[PDB]
Design an enzyme around this catalytic site. Sequence first.
Site, mmCIF file in Angstrom:
data_model
loop_
_atom_site.group_PDB
_atom_site.id
_atom_site.type_symbol
_atom_site.label_atom_id
_atom_site.label_comp_id
_atom_site.label_asym_id
_atom_site.label_seq_id
_atom_site.Cartn_x
_atom_site.Cartn_y
_atom_site.Cartn_z
ATOM 1 N N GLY A 116 -13.351 -3.456 -4.492
ATOM 2 C CA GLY A 116 -14.317 -2.500 -5.147
ATOM 3 C C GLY A 116 -13.513 -1.306 -5.498
ATOM 4 O O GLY A 116 -13.638 -0.822 -6.663
ATOM 5 N N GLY A 175 -9.105 -0.561 0.595
ATOM 6 C CA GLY A 175 -8.986 -1.534 1.631
ATOM 7 C C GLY A 175 -8.143 -2.638 1.525
ATOM 8 O O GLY A 175 -7.606 -3.236 2.500
ATOM 9 N N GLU A 176 -7.794 -2.767 0.257
ATOM 10 C CA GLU A 176 -6.917 -3.874 -0.039
ATOM 11 C C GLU A 176 -5.566 -3.422 -0.030
ATOM 12 O O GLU A 176 -4.671 -4.432 0.317
ATOM 13 C CB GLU A 176 -7.300 -4.372 -1.616
ATOM 14 N N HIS A 219 9.236 5.179 -8.823
ATOM 15 C CA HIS A 219 9.720 6.087 -7.192
ATOM 16 C C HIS A 219 9.585 5.280 -5.732
ATOM 17 O O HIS A 219 10.569 5.309 -5.156
ATOM 18 C CB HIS A 219 8.930 7.289 -7.132
ATOM 19 N N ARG A 255 17.569 9.118 -3.883
ATOM 20 C CA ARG A 255 16.708 9.656 -3.059
ATOM 21 C C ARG A 255 15.494 8.836 -2.661
ATOM 22 O O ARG A 255 14.772 8.878 -1.558
ATOM 23 C CB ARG A 255 16.088 10.985 -3.534
HETATM 24 O O1 RES Z 1 5.146 10.753 -5.150
HETATM 25 C C1 RES Z 1 5.720 10.471 -4.024
HETATM 26 N N1 RES Z 1 5.582 9.448 -3.443
HETATM 27 O O2 RES Z 1 4.558 8.480 -3.829
HETATM 28 C C2 RES Z 1 6.906 11.367 -3.742
HETATM 29 O O3 RES Z 1 6.243 12.749 -3.354
HETATM 30 C C3 RES Z 1 7.580 11.534 -4.986
HETATM 31 O O4 RES Z 1 8.681 10.361 -5.115
HETATM 32 C C4 RES Z 1 9.079 12.453 -4.635
HETATM 33 O O5 RES Z 1 9.917 12.619 -5.651
HETATM 34 P P1 RES Z 1 10.612 13.963 -6.168
HETATM 35 O O6 RES Z 1 11.898 13.952 -5.109
HETATM 36 O O7 RES Z 1 11.122 13.929 -7.423
HETATM 37 O O8 RES Z 1 9.744 15.139 -5.805
HETATM 38 O O1 RES Z 2 -13.833 -1.619 -1.917
HETATM 39 C C1 RES Z 2 -13.555 -2.345 -0.953
HETATM 40 N N1 RES Z 2 -12.613 -2.216 -0.201
HETATM 41 O O2 RES Z 2 -11.733 -0.954 -0.461
HETATM 42 C C2 RES Z 2 -14.400 -3.523 -0.825
HETATM 43 O O3 RES Z 2 -14.114 -4.366 -1.894
HETATM 44 C C3 RES Z 2 -15.905 -3.245 -0.745
HETATM 45 O O4 RES Z 2 -16.043 -2.419 0.555
HETATM 46 C C4 RES Z 2 -16.647 -4.408 -0.670
HETATM 47 O O5 RES Z 2 -18.182 -3.975 -0.410
HETATM 48 P P1 RES Z 2 -19.411 -4.854 -0.648
HETATM 49 O O6 RES Z 2 -19.206 -5.604 0.571
HETATM 50 O O7 RES Z 2 -20.373 -3.962 -0.856
HETATM 51 O O8 RES Z 2 -19.051 -5.535 -1.992
#
Ligand code: RES
Ligand code: RES
Lengths: 157, 157
Positions: A69, A73-74, A101, A136
């Site tokens: 949804g 959770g996935e 990244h 990095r």
């Molecule tokens: O967005 C991020 N992780 O999802 C990190 O903060 C991001 O890769 C860091 O990048 P930067 O080292 O160019 O700031």
């Molecule tokens: O979004 C979700 N997990 O992040 C699930 O698909 C969601 O909680 C399922 O809800 P439902 O059982 O009301 O369809």
Amino acid sequence: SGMRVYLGADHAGYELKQRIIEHLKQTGHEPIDCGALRYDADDDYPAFCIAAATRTVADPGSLGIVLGGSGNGEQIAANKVPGARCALAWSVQTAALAREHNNAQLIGIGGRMHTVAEALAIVDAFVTTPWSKAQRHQRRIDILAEYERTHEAPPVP
Amino acid sequence: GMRVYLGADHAGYELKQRIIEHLKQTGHEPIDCGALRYDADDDYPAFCIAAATRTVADPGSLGIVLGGSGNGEQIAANKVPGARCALAWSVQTAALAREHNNAQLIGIGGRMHTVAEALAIVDAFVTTPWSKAQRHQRRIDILAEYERTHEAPPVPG
Ligand SMILES: O=C(NO)[C@H](O)[C@H](O)COP(=O)(O)O
Ligand SMILES: O=C(NO)[C@H](O)[C@H](O)COP(=O)(O)O
């Protein structure tokens, strides 16, 4: 260019998963359905997402997409799999930055959060954006992989 | 959620300081896991693993990890045993993280939102209660059982 993609989804992301499989076949990629194979309003997401993430890690070079949804959770379930890195893609930019990244092999998408056209645009960016290989980014991935190995939290600067 | 553990790298550092001030003004007790200063080259994994570890070890607490997109941050938090970290990019997904996923933590991308948009996401996260519904609890239990054994649960079908 053509990528293998393992897809997992519960009932909330089932319809969008079938459209993504169709879109991936038509754009030169190779989708593999881990389930759910039909709509079941009561089914549970964890098994489908762990199956998609597990097979992605065991098949290097492949990608994966888990659907729910909200997709949250996935991606959480997929992130419990050893070696897996699953970002939540809610836009073209975050899908691209997941690869660039974070070298994320998987992404979660919320079926209730986007239209069909917006979701397929997210998928396109995920399967075409290359991993940057910047020092990095690889350093951060190595630190997280080391914590996954021993579960000994690294010291903070 | 009264005590709230916040972790972040340089890309989410400035937004983390603004969230700490906002949380003090709304009757919460924010706890800074780092980074305590701006360091352009610092790595996110350690700050996010520290925030997720302390949140899970502290009943009733929540946590927020910040980065550029917040995706590598939630991924690192999700490697911690017991942790469930959603990526919140809206009021809806922050609220659903609590309601459906019982997420003790959320990741936020400081580059993806304005300050006002990010604080609204934080408000929804700390005020939305965990639903305790049967199906949601069942899914969290399947995930926690996978964390313990690393035995992928069978796929329906
Ligand atoms: O967005 C991020 N992780 O999802 C990190 O903060 C991001 O890769 C860091 O990048 P930067 O080292 O160019 O700031
Ligand atoms: O979004 C979700 N997990 O992040 C699930 O698909 C969601 O909680 C399922 O809800 P439902 O059982 O009301 O369809």
